[PDB]
Amino acid sequence: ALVLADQGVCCIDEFDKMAEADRTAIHEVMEQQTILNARCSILAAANPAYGRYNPRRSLEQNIQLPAALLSRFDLLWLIQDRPDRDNDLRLAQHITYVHQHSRQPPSQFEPLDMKLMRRYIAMCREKQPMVPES
């Protein structure tokens, strides 16, 4: 799977639900993008061990992954299902509108098409900016 997504994106979910043996091989792919070449962007998804994130416990214990593996991820994003009444009502109404109207709720600007975004990303990948010394 890692080789198949060369020069692409490897989206993997249930990362926390995998044996450490594969995790060990994942470190080389993360550090050197090689296995063969594995030049891919890794997008991993994870869940808490107990089903709920506990802020009391440390991050590593709640993720049951080594600190080095998390460090090799350049970005970490935690999402918690914090219960807020107004936010819950807004989410519920948006879900209702998406369900009924077959469409997203009307935002300020209509989102661009998938093909247009793909072409824009392809063109933006073509440029190689140089970092100024200032």
Partner 1 sequence: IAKIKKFSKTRSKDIFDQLAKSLAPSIHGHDYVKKAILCLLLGGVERDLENGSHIRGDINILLIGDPSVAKSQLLRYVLCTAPRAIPTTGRGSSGVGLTAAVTTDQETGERRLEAGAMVLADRGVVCIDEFDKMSDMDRTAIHEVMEQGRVTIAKAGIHARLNARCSVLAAANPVYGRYDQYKTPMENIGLQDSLLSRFDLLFIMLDQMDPEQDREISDHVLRMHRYRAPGEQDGDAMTQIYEKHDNLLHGTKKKKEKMVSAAFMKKYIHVAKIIKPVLTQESATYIAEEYSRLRSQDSMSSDTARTSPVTARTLETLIRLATAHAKARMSKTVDLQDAEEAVELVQYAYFKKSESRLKAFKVALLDVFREAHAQSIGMNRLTESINRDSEEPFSSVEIQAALSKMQDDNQVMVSEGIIFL
- For binding to partner 1 (CB under 8 A), which residues are involved? 51, 85, 88-89, 91-93, 95-96, 99-100, 102-103
- The response to whether 54 counts as a known ligand-binding position is no
- Of 56 and 99, which has the nearer Cβ to partner 1? 99
Do 16 and 46 contact (CB within 8 A), yes or no? yes
- Of 74 and 84, which has the nearer Cβ to partner 1? 84
Q: How far apart are CA 75 and CA 20, in angstroms?
A: 21
- The response to whether 62 counts as a known ligand-binding position is no
- Provide CB contacts within 8 A for 82, sequence distance 6+: none
Q: Which residues fall in the annotated binding site for ATP?
A: 47, 72
